[PDB]
């Protein structure tokens, strides 16, 4: 019978054009039939059976049933067997390893149930089985990490879609809870019907990837009035559908503990209550799965999207204290700041004046302004038209707003800060057939889970920003095996081919062991030369006229010499490299804005004789004088420091060209600044990979087991306006700037189209785990 919801409640073939709908999203579209809340959302007698309800006569108006025939109809309360058939709650069963998916007949695959909780800070898991018995046993039985790193901004909507796509917000388009698309000339918001339009959403989410490859998904979404218990009973009821109508992947999301976390903060005593109610819902799901004889078949992912931080209104910075006029600008306020012009036609609006008026203007300033290209590359922002040119990175525990008027304490917790902040770290737990038994894994970013979930359903994942294989150690059996990217350009090994008289670069001068993990593979068409020296090895690009990488090893005992005062302006030609593909000092001395540095520092030479190799023209790179304060401190103080703390370090350094701020290696046509009157391109960033042995008892060049690595992508900027303390000695701000721009080896690989750690004696999945490690310093 058409026109009403009986026989169709939460049907997985929902559609507005035909009839009124009865699915779990009819509320959000305001299109439910008149009998939806009467038939599909029954709430009589609650969600728990009792001793007296055992074997009752079927009353169809009850919320859930405790009759005898409910197991066949597939709509018992989740505690039916526990209270009526003497069974035990799943949380009380001992932890028994699942060596193989024990599934009842009919299941092509272990079902995947995604359980998402908003605002579940990683600190919450320290409450134990006293508050959350079901969650802690999922964590101890299955696979878990100390925390999971979200994406920036650490907000629900960008993170929930990132979890479903594996892409950064810059690529899937959901760059914030609120955003303005200038092409649409429209505003995206949390509340409202604008979010329902498909134009805002890029990438390919998990449910679309499953649908396209013949794996039914159903409906991932739940209208907010549908209670959590009804959402669980709906999922369990779907699990009893016939074979070719039963979805394989399911998703539950909960708005707690985000709501209570905002009202009371992450450490409020009121936080205990919602975390009990969340574990109750987890208990209902696992009780129902055991009741369905699926507790040893289903895969369950308990995941969060963002943490929570203590934020009060008394800690809100106001732009009206900084800018002469705030009426000409529109600001996205809160734990992050995005500033654009309020008027289409306003030529009196200039970003350089606003950025300057916001740059180190007050002591104890709790925000920092950035052009989006100058944000730390680990954030992977910028590359989207919905991302404004002016971004304010807000200090943790603080807010920023335009005026005090747009501000009228209502809240005690908030989120959205840098994704490396401790309070923003969230949780991940994997329990089920394919997940490992009682295993802890290192922290990882949520961009990597999309590959795992498709692997759990046999789906080929759409292109994403996870490094497929870096999470292979999460599963019991992996169908996917990573492929080392094959080398595109083979290197040249040039000997001495020229005489020093062949060179007229206008340059003066008054006169294995260093490649520990194999050479980097060049993954694009170019021409470069391998150059061996006593102290360092480098792959010199003949196209960019500078090395793409330079590798050298500093022992724990290595001494730091100094350039003699008569050799400080010494640059020598490389007789192995043609003068046609060499840099020249006349370019640098005629460029009044640019100086030069060295990828291998002459301060770390093993001998004055070998020091002349450091002054080769093939070891030099264009560097602004203000950046040379940062580069020279890193090479002369910090590398020796790192080699002392870590029993030697292997340093791989090189330039990065990303003028279009898309995170990918630029080709020749995208470089927008050269050395004046030259063909020497100006790098936008400089990277370094500092590798040691995880077992510090062994030196870096004699390491047997896993490695310890840390990387940075220092922005090559002509001023130090980013560091407000740059007036003082380099021991008071440089290390802080580098900690801000920490990076994964993976991010350097994207920005240079290179591949590191190819001959390591470790398994490639373990290496893929290393290349995704982010040293957060927190
Ligand atoms: C994160 O992953 C996404 C998706 O893999 C990456 O974005 C993709 O970037 C590539 C390279 O720029 C784009 O490919 C190109 O497509 C154009 C047509 O638009 C055409 O010239 C070629 O087919 C070329 O391959 C691709 O369209 C784009 N896709 C999406 C969905 O964004 C992104 O670069 C990754 N981020 C990082 C930091 O690696
Ligand atoms: C409970 C409501 C208030 C929350 C609104 C839910 C909203 C986030 C969901 C509901 C419908 C979803 C879209 C739909 O599933 C189809 C796809 C196709 C895919 O290629 C891109 C994403 C998209 C458009 C979904 C986006 C998220 C939606 C709007
Ligand atoms: C497949 C992995 C994802 C698991 C399934 C989640 C659904 C897929 C994600 C879709 C992107 C849009 C989110 C869906 C609705 C979000 C429901 C929700 O809970 O929103 C609450 C959020 O406003 C409040 O948090 P904040 O304002 O950021 O503090
Ligand atoms: Ca680029
Ligand atoms: Ca300064
Ligand atoms: Zn949330």
Determine the angle formed by the axes of helices 156-165 and 449-456, rounding to 10 degrees.
Answer: 50
Structure tokens that stand for 190 in this block? 């949390």
Structure tokens that stand for 211 in this block? 């649908």
CA distance 72 to 775: 53
CA distance 21 to 10: 9
Structure tokens that stand for 20 in this block? 């009124």
CA distance 431 to 454: 16
Q: Answer yes or no: is the C-beta of 487 below 6 A from any ligand 3 atom.
A: no
Q: With CA atoms as reference, report the closest residue to 403 among 335, 275, 317.
A: 317
CATH topology of domain 500-770: Extracellular Endonuclease; Chain A (3.40.570)
Cα–Cα distances in Å, from 443 out to 38, 145, 420, 461, 508?
46, 5, 12, 22, 50
CA distance 231 to 253: 9
Element (DSSP H or E) covering residue 274: helix 272-291
Structure tokens that stand for 1 in this block? 């019978």
CA distance 747 to 740: 15
Q: With CA atoms as reference, report the closest residue to 393 among 445, 338, 326.
A: 338
Element (DSSP H or E) covering residue 367: strand 367-371
Task: Report which ligand 2 atom has the smallest distance to the Cα of 200.
Answer: 24
Residues in CB range of 506: below 8 A, 6 or more apart: 584, 585, 586, 589
Element (DSSP H or E) covering residue 299: strand 299-304
Structure tokens that stand for 351 in this block? 């970003």
**Bond prior to 153 in cis (omega within 30° of 0):** yes
Q: With CA atoms as reference, report the closest residue to 318 among 410, 398, 421.
A: 398
Q: Answer yes or no: is the C-beta of 118 below 6 A from any ligand 3 atom.
A: yes
Is the distance from CB of 656 to CB of 670 less than 8 angstroms? no
Of all protein residues, the one whose alpha carbon is nearest to atom 25 of ligand 3 is: 156
Q: With CA atoms as reference, report the closest residue to 576 among 614, 616, 536.
A: 616
Q: Tell whether residue 306 is among the known ligand binding residues.
A: yes
Q: Answer yes or no: is the C-beta of 612 below 6 A from any ligand 3 atom.
A: no
Q: Find where tokens 């197991």 sit.
A: 71
CA distance 450 to 461: 7
Vertex 236, ends 196 and 448: CA angle to 5°?
A: 55
Maximal C-alpha separation, the chain = 103
The length of the chain in residues reads 778
Q: With CA atoms as reference, report the closest residue to 328 among 408, 403, 407, 404.
A: 403
SS3 content of the chain, % helix, strand, coil (to 5): 30, 20, 55
CA distance 375 to 398: 19
Q: Tell whether residue 258 is among the known ligand binding residues.
A: yes
Is the distance from CB of 176 to CB of 160 less than 8 angstroms? no
Q: Which ligand is nearest to the CA of 224?
A: 2
**Resolution of the experimental model, in Å, one decimal:** 2.4
- Ligand 6 centroid to Cα of residue 110, in Å, is 28
Q: SS3 of 634, please?
A: helix
CA distance 376 to 714: 8
Task: Report which ligand 1 atom has the smallest distance to the Cα of 168.
Answer: 1
What's the N-to-C CA distance of the chain in angstroms?
Answer: 61
Q: Find where tokens 């879609």 sit.
A: 161
Is the distance from CB of 142 to CB of 437 less than 8 angstroms? yes
Residues in CB range of 424: below 8 A, 6 or more apart: 150, 154, 306, 307, 309, 415, 417, 418
Q: Answer yes or no: is the C-beta of 81 below 6 A from any ligand 3 atom.
A: no
Write down the architecture of domain 314-408 according to CATH. 2-Layer Sandwich (3.30)
Task: Report which ligand 2 atom has the smallest distance to the Cα of 196.
Answer: 29
Residues 675/680/683/689 CA torsion (nearest 10 deg): -140
Query: How crowded is residue 39: how many other Cβ atoms within 10 Å of its Cβ?
Result: 18
DSSP letter for each residue of 655-691? EE--TT-SSSPPPGGG---BSTTSS-B--SEEEEEEE
Which 8-state DSSP code applies to residue 521?
Answer: E
- Ligand 6 centroid to Cα of residue 419, in Å, is 15
CA distance 643 to 524: 33
Which of the residues 156, 335, 742, 769 is marked catalytic? Answer: 156
Is the distance from CB of 137 to CB of 89 less than 8 angstroms? no
Structure tokens that stand for 204 in this block? 């390919």
Specify which residues 370 forms β-bridges with. 391
Structure tokens that stand for 42 in this block? 């029954």
Residue 669: phi and psi, rounded to 5, are: -75, -5
* Burial of 693: CB neighbours in 10 Å, binned 0-12, 13-18, 19+: buried
Which 8-state DSSP code applies to residue 339?
Answer: E
CA distance 118 to 177: 13
Q: What sign does the dihedral 221-227-228-231 (CA atoms) show?
A: negative
Does domain 1-34 sit in CATH 4.10.410.20?
yes
Give the mutation target among 195, 206, 211, 219 for probing the ligand 2 site: most ligand atoms within 8 A of CB: 195
Does domain 110-167+203-309+423-474 sit in CATH 3.40.50.720?
no
Vertex 500, ends 494 and 504: CA angle to 5°?
A: 110
Decide if 156 is catalytic.
yes
Strand 439-440 to strand 143-144: parallel, antiparallel, or no bridges (unpaired)? Answer: parallel
CA distance 386 to 338: 10
Q: Tell whether residue 177 is among the known ligand binding residues.
A: yes
Is the distance from CB of 35 to CB of 52 less than 8 angstroms? no
Of all protein residues, the one whose alpha carbon is nearest to atom 21 of ligand 2 is: 201
Experimental method: X-ray
Of all protein residues, the one whose alpha carbon is nearest to atom 35 of ligand 1 is: 465
Is the distance from CB of 367 to CB of 319 less than 8 angstroms? no
Element (DSSP H or E) covering residue 765: helix 764-770
**Bond prior to 257 in cis (omega within 30° of 0):** yes
* Burial of 479: CB neighbours in 10 Å, binned 0-12, 13-18, 19+: exposed
Is the distance from CB of 244 to CB of 395 less than 8 angstroms? no
Residues in CB range of 339: below 8 A, 6 or more apart: 319, 329, 330, 331, 332, 354, 388, 390, 391, 392
Q: With CA atoms as reference, report the closest residue to 169 among 182, 183, 153, 156.
A: 153
- Ligand 3 centroid to Cα of residue 289, in Å, is 24
Residue 609: phi and psi, rounded to 5, are: -70, -45
CA distance 601 to 650: 14
Residues 525/527/533/538 CA torsion (nearest 10 deg): -30
CA distance 285 to 115: 10
CATH 3.40.720.10 domain locations along the chain: 110-167+203-309+423-474
Query: How crowded is residue 608: how many other Cβ atoms within 10 Å of its Cβ?
Result: 11
Residues in CB range of 345: below 8 A, 6 or more apart: none
Q: With CA atoms as reference, report the closest residue to 654 among 751, 577, 576, 725.
A: 751
Determine the angle formed by the axes of helices 272-291 and 228-238, rounding to 10 degrees.
Answer: 20
- Ligand 4 centroid to Cα of residue 642, in Å, is 30
CATH 3.30.1360.180 domain locations along the chain: 314-408
- Ligand 2 centroid to Cα of residue 196, in Å, is 6
DSSP letter for each residue of 316-376? EEEGGGT-S--TTEEEE-BSEEEEEESSSS-TT--HHHHHHHTSS-STT--EEEEEGGGS-
Structure tokens that stand for 194 in this block? 């604008």
CATH 3.40.570.10 domain locations along the chain: 500-770
Query: How crowded is residue 13: how many other Cβ atoms within 10 Å of its Cβ?
Result: 12
CA distance 656 to 684: 6
CA distance 221 to 213: 20
Cα–Cα distances in Å, from 590 out to 61, 83, 148, 583, 585?
87, 86, 50, 13, 8
Is the distance from CB of 559 to CB of 582 less than 8 angstroms? no
Q: Answer yes or no: is the C-beta of 435 below 6 A from any ligand 3 atom.
A: no
Q: Find where tokens 């079927």 sit.
A: 58
């Amino acid at each position: 019978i058409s026109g009403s919801c009986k026989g169709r409640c939460f049907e997985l073939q929902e559609a507005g054009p035909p009839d009124c709908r009865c699915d779990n999203l009819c509320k959000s579209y305001t299109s439910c039939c008149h009998d939806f809340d009467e038939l599909c959302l029954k709430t009589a007698r609650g969600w728990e059976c009792t001793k007296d309800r055992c074997g009752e006569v079927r009353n169809e108006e009850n919320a859930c049933h405790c009759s005898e025939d409910c197991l066949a109809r597939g709509d018992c309360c989740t505690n039916y067997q526990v209270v009526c058939k003497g069974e035990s709650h799943w949380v009380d069963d001992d932890c028994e390893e699942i060596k193989a998916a024990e599934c009842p007949a009919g299941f092509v695959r272990p079902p995947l149930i995604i359980f998402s909780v908003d605002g579940f800070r990683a600190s919450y898991m320290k409450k134990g089985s006293k508050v959350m018995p079901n969650i802690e046993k999922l964590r101890s039985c299955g696979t878990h990490s100390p925390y999971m790193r979200p994406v920036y901004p650490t907000k629900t909507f960008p993170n929930l879609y990132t979890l479903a796509t594996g892409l950064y917000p810059e690529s899937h388009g959901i760059v914030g809870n609120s955003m303005y698309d200038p092409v649409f000339d429209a505003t995206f918001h949390l509340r409202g019907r604008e979010k329902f339009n498909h134009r805002w959403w890029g990438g390919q989410p998990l449910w679309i990837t499953a649908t396209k490859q013949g794996v039914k998904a159903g409906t991932f979404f739940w209208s907010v009035v549908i209670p959590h218990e009804r959402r669980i009973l709906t999922i369990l009821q779907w699990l009893t559908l016939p074979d070719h109508e039963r979805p394989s992947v399911y998703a539950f999301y909960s708005e707690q503990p985000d709501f209570s976390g905002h009202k009371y903060g992450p450490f409020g005593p009121e936080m205990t209550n919602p975390l009990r109610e969340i574990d109750k819902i987890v208990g209902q799901l696992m009780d129902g799965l055991k009741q369905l004889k699926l507790h040893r078949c289903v895969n369950v992912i308990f995941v969060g999207d963002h943490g929570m931080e203590d934020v009060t209104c008394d800690r809100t910075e106001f732009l009206s204290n900084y800018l002469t006029n705030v009426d000409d600008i529109t600001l996205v306020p809160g734990t992050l700041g995005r500033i654009r012009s309020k008027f289409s036609n306003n030529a009196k609006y200039d970003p350089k004046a606003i950025i300057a008026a916001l740059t180190c203007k007050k002591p104890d300033q709790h925000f920092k302004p950035y052009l989006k290209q100058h944000l730390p590359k680990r954030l992977h922002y910028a590359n989207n038209r919905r991302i404004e040119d002016i971004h304010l990175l807000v200090e943790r525990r603080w807010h920023v707003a335009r005026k005090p008027l747009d501000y009228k304490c209502f809240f005690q917790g908030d989120h959205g800060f840098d994704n490396k902040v401790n309070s923003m770290q969230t949780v991940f737990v994997g329990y089920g057939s394919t997940f490992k038994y009682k295993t802890k894994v290192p922290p990882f970013e949520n961009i990597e889970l999309y590959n795992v979930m498709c692997d759990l359903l046999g789906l080929k994942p759409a292109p994403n920003n996870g490094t497929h294989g870096s999470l292979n150690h999460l599963l019991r059996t992996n169908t996917f095996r990573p492929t080392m990217p094959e080398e595109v350009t083979r290197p040249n090994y040039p000997g001495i081919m020229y005489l020093q008289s062949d060179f007229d670069l206008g340059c003066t001068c008054d006169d294995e062991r260093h490649l520990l993990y194999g050479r980097p593979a060049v993954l694009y068409r170019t021409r470069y030369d391998i150059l061996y020296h006593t102290d360092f090895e480098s792959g010199y690009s003949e196209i960019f006229l500078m090395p793409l990488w330079t590798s050298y090893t500093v022992s724990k005992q290595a001494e730091v010499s100094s350039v003699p005062d008569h050799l400080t302006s010494c640059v020598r030609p490389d007789v192995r490299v043609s003068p046609s593909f060499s840099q020249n000092c006349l370019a640098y001395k005629n460029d009044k804005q640019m100086s030069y540095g060295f990828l291998f520092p002459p301060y770390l030479s093993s001998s004055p004789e070998a020091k002349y190799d450091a002054f080769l023209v093939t070891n030099m790179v264009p560097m602004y004088p203000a950046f040379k304060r940062v580069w020279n401190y890193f090479q002369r103080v910090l590398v020796k420091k790192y080699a002392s703390e870590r029993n030697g370090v292997n340093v791989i350094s090189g330039p990065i060209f990303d003028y279009d701020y898309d995170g990918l290696h630029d080709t020749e046509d995208k470089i927008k600044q050269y050395v004046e009157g030259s063909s020497i391109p100006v790098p936008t960033h400089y990277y370094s990979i500092i590798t040691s042995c995880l077992d510090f008892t062994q030196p870096a060049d004699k390491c047997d087991g896993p490695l310890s690595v840390s990387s940075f992508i220092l922005p090559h900027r002509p001023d130090n306006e980013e560091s407000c303390n740059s007036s003082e000695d380099e021991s008071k701000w440089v290390e802080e700037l580098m900690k801000m721009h920490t990076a994964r080896v993976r991010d350097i690989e994207h920005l240079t189209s290179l591949d590191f750690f190819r001959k390591t004696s470790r398994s490639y999945p373990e290496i893929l785990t290393l290349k995704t490690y982010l040293h957060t310093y927190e």
